Amino acid sequence: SIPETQKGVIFYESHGKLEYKDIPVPKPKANELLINVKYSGVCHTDLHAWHGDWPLPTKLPLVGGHEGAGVVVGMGENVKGWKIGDYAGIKWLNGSCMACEYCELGNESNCPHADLSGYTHDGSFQEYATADAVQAAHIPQGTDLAEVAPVLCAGITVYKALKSANLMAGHWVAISGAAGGLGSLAVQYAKAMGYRVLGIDGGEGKEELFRSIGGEVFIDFTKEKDIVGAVLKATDGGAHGVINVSVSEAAIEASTRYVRANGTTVLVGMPAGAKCCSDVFNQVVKSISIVGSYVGNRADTREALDFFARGLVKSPIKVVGLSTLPEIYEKMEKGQIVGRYVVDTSK
Amino acid sequence: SIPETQKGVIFYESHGKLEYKDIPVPKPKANELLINVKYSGVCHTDLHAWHGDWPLPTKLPLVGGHEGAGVVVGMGENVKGWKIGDYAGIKWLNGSCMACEYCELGNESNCPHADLSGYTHDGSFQEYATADAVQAAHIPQGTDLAEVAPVLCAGITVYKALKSANLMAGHWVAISGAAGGLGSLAVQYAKAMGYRVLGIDGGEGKEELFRSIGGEVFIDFTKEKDIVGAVLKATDGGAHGVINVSVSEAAIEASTRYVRANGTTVLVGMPAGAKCCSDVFNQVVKSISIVGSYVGNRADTREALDFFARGLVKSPIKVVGLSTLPEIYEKMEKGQIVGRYVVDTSK
Amino acid sequence: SIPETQKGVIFYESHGKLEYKDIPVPKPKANELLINVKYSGVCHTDLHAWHGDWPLPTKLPLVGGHEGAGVVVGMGENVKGWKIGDYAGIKWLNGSCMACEYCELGNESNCPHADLSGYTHDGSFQEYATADAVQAAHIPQGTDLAEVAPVLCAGITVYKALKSANLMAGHWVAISGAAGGLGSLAVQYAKAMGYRVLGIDGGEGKEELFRSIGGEVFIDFTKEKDIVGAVLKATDGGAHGVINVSVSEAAIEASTRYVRANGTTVLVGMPAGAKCCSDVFNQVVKSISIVGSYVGNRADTREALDFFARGLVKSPIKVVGLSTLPEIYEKMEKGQIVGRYVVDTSK
Amino acid sequence: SIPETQKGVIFYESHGKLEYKDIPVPKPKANELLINVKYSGVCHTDLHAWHGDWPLPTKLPLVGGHEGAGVVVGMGENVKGWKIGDYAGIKWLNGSCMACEYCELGNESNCPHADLSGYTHDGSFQEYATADAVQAAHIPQGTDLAEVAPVLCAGITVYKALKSANLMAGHWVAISGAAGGLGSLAVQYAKAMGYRVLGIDGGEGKEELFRSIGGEVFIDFTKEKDIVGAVLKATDGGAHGVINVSVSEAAIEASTRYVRANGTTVLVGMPAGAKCCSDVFNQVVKSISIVGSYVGNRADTREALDFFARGLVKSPIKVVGLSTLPEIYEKMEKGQIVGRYVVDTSK
Ligand SMILES: NC(=O)c1ccc[n+]([C@@H]2O[C@H](COP(=O)([O-])OP(=O)(O)OC[C@H]3O[C@@H](n4cnc5c(N)ncnc54)[C@H](O)[C@@H]3O)[C@@H](O)[C@H]2O)c1
Ligand SMILES: NC(=O)c1ccc[n+]([C@@H]2O[C@H](COP(=O)([O-])OP(=O)(O)OC[C@H]3O[C@@H](n4cnc5c(N)ncnc54)[C@H](O)[C@@H]3O)[C@@H](O)[C@H]2O)c1
Ligand SMILES: NC(=O)c1ccc[n+]([C@@H]2O[C@H](COP(=O)([O-])OP(=O)(O)OC[C@H]3O[C@@H](n4cnc5c(N)ncnc54)[C@H](O)[C@@H]3O)[C@@H](O)[C@H]2O)c1
Ligand SMILES: NC(=O)c1ccc[n+]([C@@H]2O[C@H](COP(=O)([O-])OP(=O)(O)OC[C@H]3O[C@@H](n4cnc5c(N)ncnc54)[C@H](O)[C@@H]3O)[C@@H](O)[C@H]2O)c1
């Protein structure tokens, strides 16, 4: 069954050369399932890990990818509630200690001892990958793993973000970057949660996707000179909560100025060396909160996958081969990425 | 009874010359009480209004002061629940429309039609001042107005701040600037609310005051080279919620780095041209919220004055004459202001 | 313009004889608008006030009706933000003191000095009725007052209820009584807010209405022997939050047993002499909250009318004449009332 | 080291004869620590389990006790973050699946697969007891296990209760039963959390203990004919949140009538066959919530033990021998139990 080797996209140096090579099969640990990753979404976090954009250092050599979805071909001796052949998902947060004050409060992502799939752990860009059994996702039997894969890191993330904005049904939510991997899922989640979804994006075929997936008001950031004025006029005073899934520091800076008094500006995107320089006078006078949202926890994964299972969200995926993966980064560095890309580990 | 003129500190131009002059008695409007301001605290907001540090423009000529406490010598024809001779307080937020979506949610301070005592309305640096009857403070009979006056804008403010940090009893709260007008009241409120109060301040006689009023750990910002390291070591991982009552943009910038994961950094101080340039990567990874807190609303005023009436808080006040007021600004611009100053309108 | 008399349904004794008689025009007070009530919904609260089912005593003689919707033909001298000819709504809570600790926290309905339209104040079953100007509803210009009228007391009520259940999008909400005046609006609001709406009702043509307005799972209380088992099987463990808009004490009693652990059982209906006898062991073991929800406040009115203005909710109204009103009570006492009834004051 | 047998209080039938007998040493499972229980508090839950007062059936034969505190003399092969000789605590909730939707949200106590120490698992009334390694309490090194033991089930319980009442600092909290095992710890926690603690209890030496531990207003339930009137007069309108740690159904019934509008009535005590028959009219009109609170979770255990470690709480313990345990039940059935009793496993 479980082979001796496999294929995988591995790079031995930051910003180096991606190698679609042959790598050994990862033996599962005492509590880590061995999942035959069928499909795996490509997240911009993988591009950041390749470029080395973040202060934390990656593990080298690295096989990226933190949105794996596959079958449990193997399991460690100590795993509790899993069966071989079941569907499971390798999220960004591979595992935690489950014993510090962060994992006790449900904030498992903010843990000092967190294994990050594809950053400090062999990710999901490989045929077989290992992932903890208490943190992996309980993908229901019968789903289409290709469609599920983008939900595992871009779905739970924007779900947790919109839950962190402290919005109510009917409150304007302005997805800043609402045509990308997270922007489109953010729009679908915010539409399913009852909010009124404004969107801010630009490029070729961004407005078409945004309108199709169920947005309300789209504001082109490459054709509107004053974005703040446009959002203040469209939302009648500002968005009640902004989600910054963009990769532009200027977008984040302009995001704290079109949110209402008593609003909330969730920071989800983490561009390279970006600082949210919000004016203190305007932030205090308007009581604007600027929350930061990291990947969702286990309850958030359950609720996001439950939104998916109901058919409310559907990430627009381009399924390609694994070998094409380097070009995707180029297509993602230029910004020409619409929706999400998923890689099939088979090819 | 109500005279024809009075004395007041009035300035006709931003950063101009403060004039302890004779000014007419303000006739109350249809719903505004006429309060004989007995004492009035001096808030740093008055210094900012004098310097013109804020983008919004003041009304000129202006008599500053938004912490007035006095007796209701007169009342408009339409006031509902007030009696002549009762004790009342002129807060910063003079009045609101009580009809927009901000006043309906209790966020009366964030209202487009808000009268700001001492900024867009003749403040409390005068013998008799007028203030709305639904927004003024219900100062209980028997209190000492001299001690109450600093509670009216510096007490409700830090009470609302600590309530905005979403702290629990036992959670470390790091008052950044915990020896000034708001810092000392913030320390007393955070101590009465159950939090463990760390303090960050420096100068002559700041640590003595901080220890006396009930602080736990004091970190001298003029003798600790690495404040972030000191707070991370003292709080064991960071403060669970920071209150930025300081007037240093550098303090605000360093305040987003010693707050725990899932923390909260309430911005209360509004220095001149200050920007909270928090790192986006470190904010998103740690889920750090950066809330801004403006003056408290009517419920917050009630609860802050109720903390005062129990004797839990006591602002260290230096009661001086009104004529001394200009020098106070100097003593406040240099930073040598410890605790709070209150002016007696009589002299 | 404003006439000398008018027609109105007035009863001089509890459970007495309803008299469609001629009554004088109510002169507006200093702050109370005089609204020419065009249409007025008939709420079961009016039936309870007629029967005397509640411990509090009504004012006699009384013209009931607390869901009035009309034009502002007159206004008191002290009203602030109203224009003659504008659309306004007489809600259940006519007015408050706006000065106690309940009105300061936004809980204006829980006020010791609350005027209740149609209970302690001449209600909206009359051509012209008076209602406070800070508490009345800001009905947008262009709406259809006939359709708006049921939203004014049955819409804001169930909106506040579903907001009190502390639900999340995707959480099962079980409207117990989901075909009546409040049940149908509760179903539409819970569907617009993202929840998954289960419904419990029975009779002739209740399931048809429930399916039409957008319910998910309907459980017939006159054809299911074990309602608790049915809800536990349909919701997979119980409803995440129940709304008790029914008028059966048995329904309320059975409502605390099919709500999940960590659930919430909002009590909205107030039957005559009803007691929610929930088992203490089962409530403590499952951490079940039993919240009670009274009419919504001004923010809740704004958000409920904003849900209506978007076209998300639509109360199924039977518009009849005012003279028919007594028979409605019969049609409401027998339980044959489907949706809502509205009376046109003209006829 | 670990012996072959031990002594323990074991009963083979509900309400039968307690046998201080010799029982074998429990071998730890794969993930369960073996704790040499030094001391163990006696909770009224143990009396209920002996009497069979609850619908759920106990495991027979049973050694009760769910407040064990001891040293980790042994550990299973799969335990993660424990060392032999460390201090640990056997709480009521022995362990959970950590995989259902309740354990994911932190509500581990509400789990269908929950091991209850001393109810479905050999409790802490024995020299050596086994308890899961992810759920046991991290008792800091240096504490006095005798004093800690009552915190493990009566401390975390009332801490979670007072956190469930949604109180603010300064809000009156009325501990109903504020001289018993939970009442005294509830008073100390509510005093440390900032609330104003009213107390309701009666008997010999209850008021003395309540005054000593830091209560504010004591209301004798055996000398006040009208408890509701007394609490409404003392709290000025009612308690802002009630904690029902009593064992009287009448106390629970009267507890929903002296809580303010928008209050909260946490149900902590679970008397035999008790029903909280709260009036629906009075509950809906006043928006009174009736929350039920079960044992606290891991975060709640951490925060309660952290309140203890600061020296803020101190359960008044009578340390006795294990053999005396049956008489304690008598002393607890008659109601003559003041504070808490702890048993030393050595004797
Ligand atoms: N916080 C988390 O838990 C988490 C998880 C995964 C990814 N991320 C981060 O999210 C970011 C975005 O990921 P993605 O998959 O959406 O990337 P993407 O490149 O697929 O999409 C980025 C989007 O931003 C839009 N955009 C670019 N400039 C803009 C501007 N000035 N204003 C508005 N929109 C603008 C683009 O048009 C595109 O729609 C990355 O930094 C990624 O690492 C966060
Ligand atoms: N947000 C509101 O509702 C509200 C209301 C009133 C005032 N304010 C603002 O609060 C600010 C402070 O007011 P105040 O009365 O406390 O002023 P103050 O001058 O009396 O006290 C300022 C304090 O900051 C300390 N400080 C200075 N530099 C510091 C640094 N680098 N790090 C830490 N602490 C430092 C000083 O030593 C002093 O203790 C002003 O900008 C004022 O306008 C806010
Ligand atoms: N709390 C508030 O703010 C507020 C405001 C207005 C009205 N109310 C109260 O709401 C209650 C209901 O009002 P309404 O207009 O919906 O009344 P209604 O008579 O129009 O509708 C009652 C509904 O209850 C259903 N029902 C009857 N027995 C049932 C049972 N055993 N199980 C489930 N459903 C059952 C009926 O079939 C019907 O669908 C009244 O007591 C009213 O006074 C509350
Ligand atoms: N919910 C939970 O997580 C949890 C955990 C442990 C125990 N409990 C339950 O808590 C209850 C109480 O436990 P305990 O250790 O405090 O019991 P206890 O017998 O030690 O103390 C009971 C207290 O109730 C007081 N009391 C009696 N009648 C009263 C009345 N009419 N009004 C007010 N006070 C009255 C007594 O005087 C005494 O102070 C038990 O039912 C127990 O099983 C709950």
Ligand SMILES: [Zn+2]
């Ligand atoms: Zn990602």
Ligand SMILES: [Zn+2]
């Ligand atoms: Zn951890």
Ligand SMILES: [Zn+2]
């Ligand atoms: Zn101020």
Ligand SMILES: [Zn+2]
């Ligand atoms: Zn306003």
Ligand SMILES: [Zn+2]
């Ligand atoms: Zn009604």
Ligand SMILES: [Zn+2]
């Ligand atoms: Zn009131």
Ligand SMILES: [Zn+2]
């Ligand atoms: Zn117990």
Ligand SMILES: [Zn+2]
């Ligand atoms: Zn579980």
